[PDB]
Amino acid sequence: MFDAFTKVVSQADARGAYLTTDQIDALTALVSDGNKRMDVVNRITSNSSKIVADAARSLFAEQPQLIAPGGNAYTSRRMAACLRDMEIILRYVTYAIFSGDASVLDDRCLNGLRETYIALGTPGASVAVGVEKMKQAALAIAGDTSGITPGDCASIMSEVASYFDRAAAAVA
């Protein structure tokens, strides 16, 4: 995996280049906002049980055929697997917003997952609606103005949104 800093480093090494002062400026910008980035990790993680359960509950309400007999989330084993899936993805998203780079989410989670779901017969689009739901809730939690120093977390929220959308796109 990479993080924000090693991502620009790998890109530079590919080019036999030193990092440019502009690039360093952008990284120092990310560092100056580091407190906020923690908060995002901390808040999503702190509330991740709510997020998985609420997003799943909603998904099943919206697509009832999933929990009907014969359905892909029918039986405890298949339900457990699904809940585990939502958790694993949310976990990897938090890893990406923590690292400031997507590669960990790509490499250890998303890569090949689409094919896995086709083979399994898991409805990848359904997984994606659930990821989209976890995104709305994670941001509302993350972007909440209460119990915290007021400031602007707009960059981070777009960036968190990106990781969720990227995860949703991969299972599709």
Binding site: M1, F2, D3, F5, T6, V8, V9, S10, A12, D13, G16, Y18, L19, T21, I24, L27, T28, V31, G34, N35, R37, M38, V41, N42, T45, S48, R91, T94, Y95, F98, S99, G100, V104, R108
Partner: protein, 162 residues
């Protein structure tokens, strides 16, 4: 690629765990150090030609036979000298990368993995590179935390060769 942040994630992932407070403290330390690290990388970069050519010269001074002796492994030719300074540049470039990174990861992945084979196979003496790293350490003119972290990676490279 080992940085503080990737090491924290890797290990929690080993245990199938969400990041906890432990790892958020890791991020806190990375951010604390990052000013110093990024300043050091910029300092080294902007003086790269002098350090690199100075360090090459320091190796030739310490080991004169390296500029006389017959062999593609020696700096006894126009081209051979070119190769040498190039390796020394690679070293310095890696030191900057580690500084940007807050970790030895870039050096480990790009330089140190398989180095011993390279040096054995091309008959290059670890002791040459050790000298240059020592010269760069003496001559970068960094101070404070930047110097200390920069020196950690230069010294890490000497441990790697020793």
């Amino acid at each position: 690629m080992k940085t503080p942040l990737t090491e924290a994630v890797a290990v929690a992932d080993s245990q199938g765990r969400f990041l906890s407070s432990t790892e958020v403290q890791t991020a806190f330390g990375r951010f604390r150090q990052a000013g110093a690290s990024l300043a050091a990388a910029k300092g080294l970069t902007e003086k790269a030609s002098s350090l690199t050519s100075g360090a090459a010269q320091a190796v030739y001074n310490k080991f004169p036979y390296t500029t006389q002796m017959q062999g593609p492994n020696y700096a006894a030719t126009q081209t051979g000298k070119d190769k040498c300074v190039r390796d020394i540049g690679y070293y310095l470039r890696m030191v900057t990368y580690c500084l940007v990174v807050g970790g030895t990861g870039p050096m480990d992945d790009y330089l140190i993995g398989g180095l011993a084979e390279i040096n054995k196979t091309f008959e290059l003496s670890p002791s040459w590179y050790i000298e240059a790293l020592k010269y760069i350490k003496a001559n970068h003119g960094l101070s404070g935390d930047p110097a200390v972290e920069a020196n950690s990676y230069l010294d890490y490279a000497i441990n790697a060769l020793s």
